[PDB]
Short mmCIF file of C-alpha atoms and ligand atoms in Angstrom, two decimals:
data_model
loop_
_atom_site.label_atom_id
_atom_site.label_comp_id
_atom_site.label_asym_id
_atom_site.label_seq_id
_atom_site.Cartn_x
_atom_site.Cartn_y
_atom_site.Cartn_z
CA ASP A 1 62.56 111.13 247.67
CA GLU A 2 61.99 114.71 248.86
CA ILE A 3 64.26 117.31 250.40
CA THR A 4 63.75 120.68 251.99
CA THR A 5 66.05 123.68 252.17
CA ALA A 6 65.65 127.42 252.81
CA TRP A 7 66.38 130.55 250.79
CA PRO A 8 66.12 134.26 251.62
CA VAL A 9 63.70 134.98 248.73
CA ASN A 10 61.38 133.46 246.19
CA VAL A 11 63.34 133.07 242.90
CA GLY A 12 60.54 133.71 240.40
CA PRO A 13 60.44 134.85 237.62
CA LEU A 14 63.71 132.88 237.02
CA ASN A 15 64.47 134.60 233.76
CA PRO A 16 67.61 132.97 232.30
CA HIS A 17 68.73 136.24 230.69
CA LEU A 18 68.11 138.58 233.69
CA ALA A 19 69.52 136.35 236.43
CA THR A 20 70.18 138.00 239.80
CA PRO A 21 72.72 136.70 242.36
CA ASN A 22 69.93 135.25 244.55
CA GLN A 23 68.63 133.37 241.44
CA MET A 24 71.96 131.94 240.29
CA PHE A 25 71.60 128.64 242.13
CA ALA A 26 68.06 128.04 240.82
CA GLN A 27 69.13 129.07 237.29
CA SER A 28 71.28 125.98 236.98
CA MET A 29 68.51 123.67 238.18
CA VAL A 30 66.24 124.62 235.25
CA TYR A 31 68.44 126.00 232.44
CA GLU A 32 71.33 124.27 230.60
CA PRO A 33 74.29 125.32 228.40
CA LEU A 34 75.58 124.13 225.01
CA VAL A 35 78.77 122.81 226.68
CA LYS A 36 79.50 121.83 230.30
CA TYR A 37 82.46 123.09 232.28
CA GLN A 38 84.85 120.60 233.87
CA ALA A 39 87.22 121.08 236.82
CA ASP A 40 90.23 120.75 234.49
CA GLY A 41 89.09 123.94 232.73
CA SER A 42 87.78 122.29 229.58
CA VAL A 43 84.18 121.99 228.43
CA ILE A 44 82.48 118.79 227.27
CA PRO A 45 79.41 118.16 225.11
CA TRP A 46 76.07 118.94 226.66
CA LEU A 47 73.11 120.29 224.65
CA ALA A 48 75.68 120.44 221.83
CA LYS A 49 77.15 117.07 220.89
CA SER A 50 80.12 118.56 219.13
CA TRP A 51 81.47 121.71 217.52
CA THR A 52 83.95 123.03 214.96
CA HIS A 53 85.60 126.39 214.41
CA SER A 54 86.90 128.08 211.28
CA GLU A 55 90.68 128.53 210.90
CA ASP A 56 90.46 132.24 211.95
CA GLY A 57 88.62 131.21 215.09
CA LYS A 58 85.64 133.45 214.35
CA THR A 59 83.00 130.95 213.10
CA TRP A 60 81.82 128.25 215.50
CA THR A 61 79.36 125.60 214.41
CA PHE A 62 77.60 123.51 217.04
CA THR A 63 75.95 120.17 216.29
CA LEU A 64 73.07 119.81 218.72
CA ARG A 65 71.44 116.79 220.28
CA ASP A 66 68.20 115.93 218.51
CA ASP A 67 66.38 114.28 221.44
CA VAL A 68 65.98 117.23 223.86
CA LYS A 69 62.62 118.76 224.84
CA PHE A 70 61.96 121.76 226.97
CA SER A 71 60.02 120.76 230.08
CA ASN A 72 56.74 121.83 228.39
CA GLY A 73 57.34 119.27 225.59
CA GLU A 74 58.48 121.70 222.94
CA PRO A 75 61.62 120.69 221.09
CA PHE A 76 65.03 122.11 221.70
CA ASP A 77 66.61 122.79 218.35
CA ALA A 78 68.94 125.22 216.64
CA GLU A 79 66.14 127.70 215.94
CA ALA A 80 65.17 127.75 219.63
CA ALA A 81 68.82 128.21 220.56
CA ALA A 82 69.32 131.04 218.04
CA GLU A 83 66.17 132.76 219.38
CA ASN A 84 67.70 132.72 222.89
CA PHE A 85 70.97 134.23 221.66
CA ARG A 86 68.97 136.92 219.82
CA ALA A 87 66.97 137.68 222.98
CA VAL A 88 70.16 138.06 225.01
CA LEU A 89 71.94 140.17 222.37
CA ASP A 90 68.88 142.45 222.09
CA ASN A 91 69.93 143.43 225.69
CA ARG A 92 73.69 143.45 224.90
CA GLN A 93 74.45 146.47 227.20
CA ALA A 94 73.30 144.65 230.36
CA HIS A 95 75.84 141.89 229.67
CA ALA A 96 78.86 143.94 228.66
CA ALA A 97 80.92 142.63 231.62
CA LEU A 98 80.86 139.26 229.82
CA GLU A 99 83.23 139.41 226.83
CA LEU A 100 81.17 136.86 224.90
CA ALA A 101 78.13 139.15 224.76
CA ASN A 102 80.45 141.79 223.18
CA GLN A 103 82.04 139.31 220.85
CA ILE A 104 79.03 137.76 219.18
CA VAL A 105 78.28 139.29 215.79
CA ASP A 106 75.77 136.82 214.36
CA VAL A 107 73.89 133.71 215.35
CA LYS A 108 72.20 131.53 212.71
CA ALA A 109 70.35 128.22 212.76
CA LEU A 110 71.59 126.36 209.64
CA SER A 111 69.33 123.32 210.21
CA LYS A 112 67.49 121.81 213.19
CA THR A 113 70.77 120.47 214.52
CA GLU A 114 73.39 123.00 213.32
CA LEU A 115 73.88 126.31 215.12
CA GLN A 116 76.45 128.79 213.85
CA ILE A 117 77.88 131.55 215.97
CA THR A 118 80.13 134.23 214.44
CA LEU A 119 82.51 136.26 216.69
CA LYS A 120 84.28 139.62 216.12
CA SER A 121 87.63 138.00 216.88
CA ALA A 122 89.35 134.76 217.80
CA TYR A 123 88.32 134.34 221.43
CA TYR A 124 88.96 130.76 222.35
CA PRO A 125 87.70 131.16 225.93
CA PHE A 126 84.27 131.54 224.23
CA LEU A 127 83.49 127.97 225.25
CA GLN A 128 84.09 128.52 228.96
CA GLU A 129 81.75 131.52 228.86
CA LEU A 130 79.04 129.50 227.15
CA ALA A 131 79.26 127.15 230.13
CA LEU A 132 78.40 129.88 232.69
CA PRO A 133 75.07 129.65 234.59
CA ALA A 134 73.96 132.77 232.69
CA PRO A 135 73.11 134.25 230.25
CA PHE A 136 73.66 131.74 227.40
CA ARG A 137 71.19 129.11 228.54
CA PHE A 138 67.90 128.20 227.04
CA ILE A 139 64.25 129.02 227.76
CA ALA A 140 61.47 127.77 225.44
CA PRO A 141 60.89 130.62 222.97
CA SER A 142 57.14 130.28 223.45
CA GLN A 143 57.79 131.79 226.89
CA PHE A 144 59.36 134.97 225.60
CA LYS A 145 57.23 138.09 226.16
CA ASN A 146 56.50 139.64 222.75
CA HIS A 147 59.56 137.98 221.18
CA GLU A 148 62.02 139.16 223.87
CA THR A 149 63.24 138.09 227.30
CA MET A 150 64.75 141.42 228.39
CA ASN A 151 61.26 142.72 229.24
CA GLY A 152 60.20 139.55 231.10
CA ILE A 153 59.12 136.00 230.41
CA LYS A 154 56.10 133.82 230.84
CA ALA A 155 56.85 130.46 232.51
CA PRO A 156 60.50 129.62 233.35
CA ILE A 157 60.64 126.66 230.95
CA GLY A 158 64.11 125.14 230.59
CA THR A 159 65.54 121.76 229.42
CA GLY A 160 66.96 120.98 232.84
CA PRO A 161 66.19 118.28 235.38
CA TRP A 162 64.06 120.47 237.71
CA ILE A 163 60.85 122.44 237.11
CA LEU A 164 59.75 125.38 239.20
CA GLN A 165 56.21 124.15 239.87
CA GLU A 166 54.83 126.45 242.52
CA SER A 167 55.47 129.52 244.42
CA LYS A 168 53.67 130.85 247.43
CA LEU A 169 55.07 134.28 247.93
CA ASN A 170 57.14 134.69 251.07
CA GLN A 171 56.36 131.09 251.95
CA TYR A 172 58.02 128.59 249.59
CA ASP A 173 59.14 127.65 246.11
CA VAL A 174 58.72 124.03 245.00
CA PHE A 175 60.85 122.39 242.32
CA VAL A 176 59.85 118.99 240.96
CA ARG A 177 61.74 116.47 238.85
CA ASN A 178 61.30 116.85 235.10
CA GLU A 179 60.08 113.35 234.19
CA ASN A 180 60.91 114.06 230.53
CA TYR A 181 64.48 115.16 231.12
CA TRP A 182 66.86 114.16 228.32
CA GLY A 183 69.65 113.24 230.72
CA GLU A 184 70.49 111.74 234.09
CA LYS A 185 67.42 112.13 236.25
CA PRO A 186 67.63 112.62 239.99
CA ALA A 187 66.49 110.02 242.42
CA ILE A 188 65.00 112.95 244.35
CA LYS A 189 61.58 114.05 243.00
CA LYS A 190 60.91 117.31 244.94
CA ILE A 191 62.96 120.15 246.47
CA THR A 192 61.12 122.68 248.57
CA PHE A 193 62.68 126.09 249.37
CA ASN A 194 61.18 127.64 252.49
CA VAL A 195 61.47 131.41 252.17
CA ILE A 196 63.12 132.68 255.34
CA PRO A 197 64.64 136.07 254.88
CA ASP A 198 66.67 136.37 258.08
CA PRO A 199 69.84 134.27 258.05
CA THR A 200 69.70 133.61 261.82
CA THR A 201 66.14 132.41 261.48
CA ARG A 202 67.22 130.15 258.56
CA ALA A 203 70.02 128.66 260.60
CA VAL A 204 67.69 127.96 263.54
CA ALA A 205 65.21 126.38 261.13
CA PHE A 206 67.97 123.97 259.98
CA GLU A 207 69.03 123.17 263.55
CA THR A 208 65.52 122.40 264.75
CA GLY A 209 63.19 121.48 261.89
CA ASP A 210 62.74 119.44 258.71
CA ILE A 211 65.23 121.34 256.63
CA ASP A 212 67.79 118.92 255.27
CA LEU A 213 70.47 121.35 254.12
CA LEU A 214 71.62 124.92 253.64
CA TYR A 215 74.15 126.18 251.14
CA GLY A 216 75.63 129.30 249.73
CA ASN A 217 78.21 132.01 249.89
CA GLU A 218 78.83 134.42 252.79
CA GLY A 219 75.74 136.43 251.95
CA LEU A 220 73.55 133.30 252.19
CA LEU A 221 75.29 131.30 254.94
CA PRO A 222 77.04 133.65 257.45
CA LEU A 223 80.62 132.75 258.13
CA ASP A 224 80.19 132.71 261.91
CA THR A 225 77.15 130.41 261.55
CA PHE A 226 79.11 128.04 259.33
CA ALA A 227 82.06 127.98 261.75
CA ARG A 228 79.65 127.02 264.54
CA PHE A 229 78.07 124.26 262.47
CA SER A 230 81.46 122.92 261.42
CA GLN A 231 82.30 122.52 265.15
CA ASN A 232 79.13 120.60 265.90
CA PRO A 233 79.37 116.89 265.05
CA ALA A 234 75.54 116.77 264.88
CA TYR A 235 75.84 118.38 261.43
CA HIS A 236 77.82 117.64 258.29
CA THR A 237 79.61 120.63 256.75
CA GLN A 238 81.65 121.03 253.59
CA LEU A 239 83.68 123.72 251.86
CA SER A 240 84.17 123.74 248.07
CA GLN A 241 87.50 124.13 246.35
CA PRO A 242 88.52 127.80 245.99
CA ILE A 243 86.29 129.95 243.88
CA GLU A 244 87.19 133.64 244.12
CA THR A 245 90.36 135.25 245.40
CA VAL A 246 89.89 138.22 247.72
CA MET A 247 92.84 140.61 247.49
CA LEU A 248 94.00 144.15 247.61
CA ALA A 249 94.97 145.74 244.29
CA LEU A 250 97.94 148.09 244.79
CA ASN A 251 98.26 151.17 242.55
CA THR A 252 101.67 150.82 240.91
CA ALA A 253 101.29 154.31 239.40
CA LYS A 254 100.56 156.24 242.64
CA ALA A 255 102.95 157.05 245.46
CA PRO A 256 103.97 155.23 247.66
CA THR A 257 102.59 151.98 246.12
CA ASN A 258 104.57 152.94 242.99
CA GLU A 259 107.63 151.49 244.73
CA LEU A 260 108.16 147.74 244.37
CA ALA A 261 109.66 147.63 247.90
CA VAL A 262 106.54 149.16 249.42
CA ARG A 263 104.30 146.65 247.62
CA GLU A 264 106.56 143.79 248.71
CA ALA A 265 106.53 145.13 252.28
CA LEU A 266 102.74 145.25 252.28
CA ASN A 267 102.63 141.63 251.06
CA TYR A 268 104.92 140.52 253.93
CA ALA A 269 103.08 142.60 256.56
CA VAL A 270 99.56 141.18 256.42
CA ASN A 271 98.95 138.32 258.82
CA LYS A 272 96.54 136.46 256.51
CA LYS A 273 95.87 133.51 258.80
CA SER A 274 94.97 135.84 261.63
CA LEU A 275 92.75 138.01 259.43
CA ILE A 276 90.95 134.91 258.23
CA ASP A 277 90.66 133.34 261.73
CA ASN A 278 89.24 136.61 262.99
CA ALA A 279 87.17 138.36 260.29
CA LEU A 280 86.24 135.19 258.39
CA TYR A 281 85.94 132.89 261.41
CA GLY A 282 88.63 130.61 260.06
CA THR A 283 86.43 129.53 257.14
CA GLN A 284 88.62 130.37 254.14
CA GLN A 285 92.10 129.38 252.90
CA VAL A 286 95.05 131.75 252.93
CA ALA A 287 95.84 133.05 249.42
CA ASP A 288 99.56 133.22 248.55
CA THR A 289 98.90 133.81 244.82
CA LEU A 290 96.40 135.73 242.67
CA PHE A 291 94.91 132.43 241.53
CA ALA A 292 94.68 129.30 243.64
CA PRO A 293 96.83 126.53 242.17
CA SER A 294 93.60 124.58 241.39
CA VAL A 295 92.67 127.26 238.84
CA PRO A 296 93.26 126.13 235.27
CA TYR A 297 96.73 127.20 234.03
CA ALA A 298 97.72 128.57 237.44
CA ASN A 299 99.52 125.60 239.02
CA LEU A 300 102.82 127.43 238.76
CA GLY A 301 104.65 126.84 242.08
CA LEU A 302 104.96 130.64 242.59
CA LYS A 303 106.92 131.61 245.72
CA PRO A 304 104.74 132.77 248.62
CA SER A 305 105.59 135.88 250.62
CA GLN A 306 105.06 134.53 254.10
CA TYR A 307 103.98 136.86 256.89
CA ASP A 308 107.21 138.45 258.12
CA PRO A 309 107.06 141.91 259.66
CA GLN A 310 110.86 141.93 260.12
CA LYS A 311 111.38 141.46 256.40
CA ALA A 312 108.67 144.03 255.60
CA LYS A 313 110.46 146.60 257.73
CA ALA A 314 113.85 145.78 256.19
CA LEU A 315 112.39 146.34 252.71
CA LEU A 316 111.02 149.76 253.70
CA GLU A 317 114.21 150.78 255.44
CA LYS A 318 116.39 149.91 252.41
CA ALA A 319 113.96 151.89 250.26
CA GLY A 320 114.46 154.95 252.47
CA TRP A 321 111.26 154.77 254.55
CA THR A 322 112.74 155.13 258.02
CA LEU A 323 111.35 156.04 261.48
CA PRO A 324 112.33 159.50 262.72
CA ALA A 325 113.33 159.79 266.39
CA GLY A 326 110.26 159.75 268.62
CA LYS A 327 107.88 158.79 265.80
CA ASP A 328 105.98 155.64 264.85
CA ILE A 329 105.25 156.20 261.13
CA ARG A 330 108.10 156.04 258.60
CA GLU A 331 109.01 159.01 256.42
CA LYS A 332 111.02 159.43 253.19
CA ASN A 333 112.10 162.91 252.06
CA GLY A 334 110.04 164.24 255.02
CA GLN A 335 106.87 162.63 253.63
CA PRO A 336 105.03 160.04 255.76
CA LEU A 337 104.41 156.48 254.58
CA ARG A 338 100.66 156.89 254.05
CA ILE A 339 98.47 154.68 251.88
CA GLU A 340 94.75 155.17 251.28
CA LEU A 341 92.50 152.10 251.34
CA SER A 342 89.14 153.02 249.82
CA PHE A 343 86.26 150.58 250.24
CA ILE A 344 82.48 150.37 250.06
CA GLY A 345 81.33 151.89 253.37
CA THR A 346 78.22 149.72 253.74
CA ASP A 347 80.16 146.49 253.19
CA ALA A 348 80.70 145.08 256.70
CA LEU A 349 83.33 142.52 255.79
CA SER A 350 85.41 144.98 253.73
CA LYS A 351 85.34 147.33 256.72
CA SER A 352 86.38 144.56 259.14
CA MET A 353 89.28 143.45 256.91
CA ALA A 354 90.32 147.09 256.33
CA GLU A 355 90.58 147.68 260.09
CA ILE A 356 92.70 144.52 260.52
CA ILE A 357 94.96 145.51 257.65
CA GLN A 358 95.38 149.03 259.03
CA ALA A 359 96.49 147.60 262.36
CA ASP A 360 98.96 145.19 260.72
CA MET A 361 100.55 148.06 258.83
CA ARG A 362 100.91 150.21 261.95
CA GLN A 363 103.27 147.50 263.22
CA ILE A 364 105.61 148.16 260.26
CA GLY A 365 105.37 151.94 260.41
CA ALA A 366 102.86 152.49 257.64
CA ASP A 367 99.77 154.65 257.94
CA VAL A 368 96.85 153.06 256.09
CA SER A 369 94.07 155.69 255.89
CA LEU A 370 90.58 154.13 255.56
CA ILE A 371 88.06 155.82 253.33
CA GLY A 372 84.56 154.35 253.15
CA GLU A 373 82.42 155.63 250.30
CA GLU A 374 79.32 154.89 248.33
CA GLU A 375 79.69 151.97 245.90
CA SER A 376 79.12 154.46 243.02
CA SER A 377 82.20 156.46 244.06
CA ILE A 378 84.37 153.35 244.55
CA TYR A 379 83.26 152.24 241.05
CA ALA A 380 84.46 155.53 239.59
CA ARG A 381 87.77 155.38 241.51
CA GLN A 382 88.44 151.92 240.06
CA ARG A 383 87.80 153.15 236.54
CA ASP A 384 89.92 156.26 237.08
CA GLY A 385 92.83 154.91 239.08
CA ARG A 386 91.98 157.24 241.96
CA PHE A 387 93.01 154.77 244.62
CA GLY A 388 96.06 153.65 246.62
CA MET A 389 94.66 150.22 247.57
CA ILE A 390 91.26 148.70 246.92
CA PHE A 391 89.61 145.39 247.70
CA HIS A 392 89.18 143.29 244.61
CA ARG A 393 88.09 139.85 243.62
CA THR A 394 88.49 137.34 240.85
CA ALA A 395 85.39 135.52 239.53
CA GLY A 396 86.42 131.94 239.91
CA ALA A 397 84.12 129.40 238.16
CA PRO A 398 84.66 129.08 234.51
CA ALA A 399 85.38 132.80 233.84
CA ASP A 400 88.88 132.71 235.35
CA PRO A 401 91.72 133.00 234.64
CA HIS A 402 90.88 134.37 231.18
CA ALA A 403 88.24 136.93 232.08
CA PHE A 404 90.21 138.50 234.88
CA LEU A 405 93.30 138.70 232.69
CA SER A 406 91.31 140.07 229.71
CA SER A 407 90.20 143.13 231.76
CA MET A 408 93.77 143.97 232.79
CA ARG A 409 94.47 145.30 229.32
CA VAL A 410 91.28 147.37 228.94
CA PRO A 411 91.11 151.02 230.00
CA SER A 412 88.58 152.05 232.65
CA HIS A 413 89.14 148.90 234.69
CA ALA A 414 90.73 148.63 238.18
CA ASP A 415 93.36 146.08 237.12
CA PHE A 416 94.42 148.14 234.09
CA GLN A 417 94.84 151.19 236.33
CA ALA A 418 96.63 149.33 239.11
CA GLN A 419 99.18 148.03 236.63
CA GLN A 420 99.99 151.32 234.88
CA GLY A 421 103.29 151.84 236.74
CA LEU A 422 104.82 148.53 235.61
CA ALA A 423 107.70 148.76 233.15
CA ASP A 424 106.56 145.51 231.48
CA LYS A 425 102.93 146.56 231.24
CA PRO A 426 103.01 146.61 227.38
CA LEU A 427 104.51 143.10 227.27
CA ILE A 428 101.96 141.82 229.77
CA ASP A 429 99.07 143.28 227.75
CA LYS A 430 100.43 141.87 224.48
CA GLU A 431 100.83 138.46 226.07
CA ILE A 432 97.28 138.57 227.43
CA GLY A 433 96.07 139.44 223.94
CA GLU A 434 97.94 136.42 222.59
CA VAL A 435 96.80 133.94 225.27
CA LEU A 436 93.14 134.76 224.54
CA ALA A 437 93.64 134.35 220.81
CA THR A 438 95.92 131.31 220.77
CA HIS A 439 94.60 127.97 219.51
CA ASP A 440 97.75 126.20 220.78
CA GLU A 441 97.58 124.71 224.29
CA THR A 442 101.36 124.73 224.78
CA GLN A 443 101.65 128.39 223.92
CA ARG A 444 98.66 129.03 226.17
CA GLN A 445 100.24 127.56 229.30
CA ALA A 446 103.59 129.26 228.60
CA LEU A 447 101.89 132.63 228.26
CA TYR A 448 99.71 132.19 231.36
CA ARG A 449 102.80 131.26 233.35
CA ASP A 450 104.66 134.35 232.11
CA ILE A 451 101.80 136.80 232.80
CA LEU A 452 101.00 135.44 236.26
CA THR A 453 104.64 135.18 237.23
CA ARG A 454 105.33 138.78 236.22
CA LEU A 455 102.29 140.01 238.17
CA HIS A 456 103.36 137.94 241.16
CA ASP A 457 107.03 139.08 241.07
CA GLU A 458 106.02 142.75 240.71
CA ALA A 459 103.64 142.49 243.70
CA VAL A 460 100.75 144.19 241.96
CA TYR A 461 98.32 142.36 244.24
CA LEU A 462 98.06 141.49 247.90
CA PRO A 463 96.17 138.19 247.82
CA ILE A 464 94.42 137.55 251.15
CA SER A 465 92.10 134.54 251.00
CA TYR A 466 90.21 132.18 248.72
CA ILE A 467 86.41 132.05 249.05
CA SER A 468 84.74 128.65 249.12
CA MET A 469 81.08 127.63 248.75
CA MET A 470 79.58 126.32 252.02
CA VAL A 471 77.15 123.39 252.54
CA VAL A 472 75.63 122.33 255.87
CA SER A 473 73.47 119.25 255.95
CA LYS A 474 71.75 116.73 258.22
CA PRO A 475 73.91 113.59 258.62
CA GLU A 476 71.22 111.36 257.01
CA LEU A 477 71.39 113.32 253.79
CA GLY A 478 74.97 112.38 252.96
CA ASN A 479 77.93 114.29 251.60
CA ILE A 480 77.07 116.30 248.50
CA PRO A 481 79.68 116.17 245.78
CA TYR A 482 80.89 119.62 244.60
CA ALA A 483 80.35 120.49 241.00
CA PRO A 484 82.92 122.16 238.78
CA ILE A 485 80.76 125.29 239.07
CA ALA A 486 80.21 125.32 242.85
CA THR A 487 76.78 126.97 242.71
CA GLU A 488 75.53 124.00 240.68
CA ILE A 489 74.53 121.76 243.59
CA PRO A 490 74.43 118.25 242.04
CA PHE A 491 70.98 117.22 243.37
CA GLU A 492 71.05 113.97 241.15
CA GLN A 493 73.84 112.53 243.24
CA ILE A 494 71.68 112.67 246.33
CA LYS A 495 70.61 109.12 247.07
CA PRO A 496 67.43 108.46 249.07
NI1 NI B 1 90.39 123.81 217.69
#
């Protein structure tokens, strides 16, 4: 009834409203949302049994379960929920990347079971954002520090199935089953996280000792390690459905990526399978489209641009980018075909992919110049449009497609800047505005198809690969089912 894993760090304090990336897995073990995301893109009842919205889409009224207790035995009710929203909104700035935190105007408990949330605008993807691991999940208000969470908490008391019982710093965290959980309790009663900061040391600890499984993204489970494990029949390995897309964003307003033919050429010139086999140790899927077809609203049958250097070269040639005698880089009006790829210098994987991409483009006569900078400078370039090409990712999980599309129409964002050279940019932005505000599902799919097709046809992006969540486990443990939000390891499905 017990399992052991490993993690690079202790996760305390596990504040639901100041969650760090290394805490995001633990967050979901302890803290729960009003509504629960499903693979089909919808949300279903969870702590809220049901909900209604006003006709203008700005008032949302949630009817809550009446049988839920925080793990310390205090009731979950509308007042406790409203207190959490207040605590989050008191720190509104820290959450401004999440449109919901910007959208909420008022939260009011109408009764013990009725929670009303008022938004600035119709924003129907509201529900998908409530389903995120953070920040709109619930800690017992008794555990606030002086009536806030932004300045810290007391005990990490959620409604969830697991309780963080003990830490021994730099040694282990221990989660135990909440015996008073409102829902489906795990068969497992204890999960111990040995704190093993070095990923090679973690991997050896799995191979040798009584650690039952490891899981995570690239930062937690190195891609080369996972490839090795996936080869070895002594271990079980699994890869989730696609989460994020990794791509280049091409600046449609800056020469030479202002030319459709150049962007199309770039899309045909990258050998994605080889890049993945090499830099990513064959662990990810090739991305032909901005969103994987498993992404809600994105199963569009868009035409892939398959790796074809001959076609890439023909596109450049027709566009006037030709090789002079005795030269290996194309020129047009005496100007070489040069494209800057700016990336975060300290990011090893970005650097590895940039080098591969540079080499691919040499084969078609294009000079990709690599510029590694501080993250702070790359951030400013993205806001400003001071880039030729940049690495970029979607968010996956329940935020996409809506969140990623929403930012395309807002100034000071990479995707807005990248798209400035498109003749249909105003139509795209209007349609994104409409898709976010539409209550009609038919109109929603028609609009998503139009926006994504336009962006695909105009070759704004150079999709490279889809990132999956990795799990490696001892054979005796069993397969673990993936959850709709891949970080939410479904520990209740583990059967002793
Ligand atoms: Ni409705």
